[PDB]
Amino acid sequence: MFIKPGRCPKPAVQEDFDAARYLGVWYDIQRLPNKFQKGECATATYSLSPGVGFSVFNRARLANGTIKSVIGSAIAEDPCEPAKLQFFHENAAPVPYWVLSTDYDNYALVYSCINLGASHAAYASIVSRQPTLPEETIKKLQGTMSSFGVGVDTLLTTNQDAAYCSAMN
Amino acid sequence: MFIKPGRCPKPAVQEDFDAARYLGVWYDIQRLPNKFQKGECATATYSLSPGVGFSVFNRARLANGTIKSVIGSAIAEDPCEPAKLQFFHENAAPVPYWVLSTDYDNYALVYSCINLGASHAAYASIVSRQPTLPEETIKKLQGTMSSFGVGVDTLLTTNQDAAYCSAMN
Amino acid sequence: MFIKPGRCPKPAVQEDFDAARYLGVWYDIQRLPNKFQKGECATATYSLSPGVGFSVFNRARLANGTIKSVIGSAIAEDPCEPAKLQFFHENAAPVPYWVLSTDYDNYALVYSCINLGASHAAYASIVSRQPTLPEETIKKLQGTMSSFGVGVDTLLTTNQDAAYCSAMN
Amino acid sequence: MFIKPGRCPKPAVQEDFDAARYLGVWYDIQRLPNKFQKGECATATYSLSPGVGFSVFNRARLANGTIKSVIGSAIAEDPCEPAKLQFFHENAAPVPYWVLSTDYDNYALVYSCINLGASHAAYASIVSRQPTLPEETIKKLQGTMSSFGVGVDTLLTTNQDAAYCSAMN
Ligand SMILES: C=CC1=C(C)/C(=C/c2[nH]c(/C=C3N=C(/C=C4\NC(=O)C(C)=C4C=C)C(C)=C\3CCC(=O)O)c(CCC(=O)O)c2C)NC1=O
Ligand SMILES: C=CC1=C(C)/C(=C/c2[nH]c(/C=C3N=C(/C=C4\NC(=O)C(C)=C4C=C)C(C)=C\3CCC(=O)O)c(CCC(=O)O)c2C)NC1=O
Ligand SMILES: C=CC1=C(C)/C(=C/c2[nH]c(/C=C3N=C(/C=C4\NC(=O)C(C)=C4C=C)C(C)=C\3CCC(=O)O)c(CCC(=O)O)c2C)NC1=O
Ligand SMILES: C=CC1=C(C)/C(=C/c2[nH]c(/C=C3N=C(/C=C4\NC(=O)C(C)=C4C=C)C(C)=C\3CCC(=O)O)c(CCC(=O)O)c2C)NC1=O
């Protein structure tokens, strides 16, 4: 995660967030540097749960070409704030997952922040329904991140090159 | 939930709890009074989840013969404490669910407590793999409940009459 | 605490809340029924703390003329939300304390809610800098309470009779 | 804080922890590397609170000779676990503080852990009533830390040199 001074901000989340339209495959496009990051080509696949919330299956391509995957469950602990989710990954403690912005069909902006006293740890990701996203959409989502203090200059562009990422197919 | 003096106790939970063996159908036998309890003939069905934890489907027979059902998800937030679950029901805030004692094939004793300052609210339930449970097992589980301050003569016996409950089939 | 259907509401809190001006003595005027309420003539005294937040000293007149007192600490866990405090009483688990409305020199409306699955438990109190408060102010604060579902005809009027309460002096 | 893979461990805390005997001045002797650490010569001063818990005043000597200090409040949220404290520092989010071991008159071992998904952030400190502690006591407290996975090889010895730390007097 990205660690820096200050307490977690509380940005606005997506209004009338509809988890049913958020299901399916998302590609990782851009994100904060992540000390724990294993790989490239990252996707998140969200699916139906017979309980509440939805199920999570994330996949990434390690430098050696091995695919690393993790399974999880996503639940909105407050049903009146359906965009403020808790993610329960196998063998992980619970972490927050906030959908700050999505149009369901093209893009989403996700934020996770955990307080560490007078510092905090964050994930922040731009994702896409495709392995790329238009520069115009990226710049708008970067504008949203700068409005709660994310340094857009620090964001890393994920490797989604078709040949490099072919091991994912 | 039943409101009583004192902060939540912390009873011992089932050693080496195995959620796989805990899945399937449980019948409500006896429980604490519950002001918003709907119905009798109550069952809990626990099933596989494609993410973490397991999925919850509870059913009860309302007075006019309708079956009320609720969907939920159960997750052990700490995998080293697998008998201390959080239940996430549609339309409810998270509640704890502690498996105090089970032999998986006959009985379980479950407890849930939320602190209210110097007072608390609790659920406590004896459940069975059949619509009845032997008196000797009920008595042993009442003894466990009395060891952390549950009053035995508050417990209600659930109506599990085969004719009254036949709408459940 | 008073148990009712529904999950906790989230009423608006006092803008620009200034704990320094909120210190000193407050008299209980009206509150929700409270099964473990001890006494009448209730006052809350808030004082400086050498750490963060402020210190709490609550007093009430028991039926046999003894004064019951409790010590606590109040901390706003998020300094950007200074009217959303946590109160830590001797012998109690943490409880929320939200200053919904105050003019610092006459009245305050305080609210505390804890979720119990699909139901909740709450405290709600109208307090005054004097042992009485004008009817017009009581009526306005009842209107605020009714806007998030408090039933006005549940509220109890605290005994603040100068002769009955004289043991408090 | 020190960040590494895995979830927070839950080590045993000091039995019958008595906050009254823990009050006064403690010197920082040894601790985990701390990405947020400002200075050397660190002391913690714990004092009476008119509310619950105790008040905190920490001081350290920066490389330029300026003294940095912070104020805080310490509260045990569960009165039955008085060694498991929450520390509320001015402008910080709440952080845990566990007294793992103390004899009140010579030494204490303190641990703080916050989960970051499949990693965690920790503080771990050996403190003393004096600017030094016997090697025998340090080695015993290091044994306690190794028993829940702390790498004693990573611990840093705090500069408590009388001449360097004279700016603290
Ligand atoms: C932004 C919020 C965000 C959260 C809450 C998050 C948490 C998170 N992601 C994980 C894995 C993972 N997370 C991803 C990918 C994603 N995960 C996503 O939330 C998204 C949007 C993607 C990208 C498409 C992958 C591929 C893994 C497994 C490999 C790895 O650990 O890097 C893990 C578990 C690590 C483990 O088991 O070792 C956590 C706790 N990651 C995030 O980026
Ligand atoms: C002891 C722990 C215990 C917990 C944590 C618990 C929680 C719990 N049970 C619920 C419903 C329900 N719970 C049950 C039944 C059960 N529920 C069970 O956990 C068990 C063991 C049974 C019985 C076999 C049923 C039938 C419903 C739906 C009907 C109703 O609302 O009463 C709800 C939601 C109510 C709503 O949406 O209005 C909560 C929060 N109930 C408990 O009894
Ligand atoms: C509305 C929020 C509200 C909160 C958070 C609250 C909590 C609260 N009040 C308590 C006691 C008490 N609380 C009060 C009085 C007050 N307490 C107040 O917060 C206010 C505004 C007054 C009144 C002026 C008194 C007199 C006691 C001690 C007597 C008693 O236990 O009833 C206790 C501890 C009980 C014990 O140790 O047994 C709690 C948890 N009370 C509330 O009314
Ligand atoms: C081991 C638990 C432990 C906790 C919970 C802890 C938390 C903690 N210590 C802080 C400051 C501080 N903490 C210390 C010192 C100490 N603090 C102590 O808990 C102890 C035992 C000492 C040492 C004697 C000092 C001197 C500061 C202020 C200067 C600095 O930020 O380094 C801050 C606030 C930083 C700020 O306002 O910028 C936090 C959150 N530090 C810890 O070491």
Side-chain angles (χ1 to χ4, degrees), chain A residues 22 26-28 31 34 36-39 42-44 46 58-60 68-70 87 89-93 95-97 110-112 123-125 127, chain D residues 116-118:
Chain A
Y22 195 74
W26 292 100
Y27 299 84
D28 200 64
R31 64 165 51 245
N34 171 18
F36 315 146
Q37 195 166 306
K38 304 295 188 229
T43 65
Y46 305 138
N58 301 332
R59 301 173 79 222
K68 190 87 142 266
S69 66
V70 303
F87 271 47
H89 302 85
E90 196 178 3
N91 315 319
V95 303
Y97 181 112
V110 178
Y111 185 67
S112 183
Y123 297 108
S125 172
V127 300
Chain D
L116 299 176

Side-chain angles (χ1 to χ4, degrees), chain B residues 116-118, chain C residues 26-28 31 34 36-39 42-44 46 58-60 68-70 87 89-93 95-97 110-112 123-125 127:
Chain B
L116 297 176
Chain C
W26 292 95
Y27 295 84
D28 198 56
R31 62 161 54 243
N34 169 20
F36 305 114
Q37 168 157 334
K38 316 150 179 100
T43 66
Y46 303 134
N58 299 333
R59 300 174 75 233
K68 181 54 184 311
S69 65
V70 59
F87 274 40
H89 306 89
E90 235 193 325
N91 308 325
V95 304
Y97 181 110
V110 179
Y111 182 71
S112 178
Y123 292 108
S125 173
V127 293

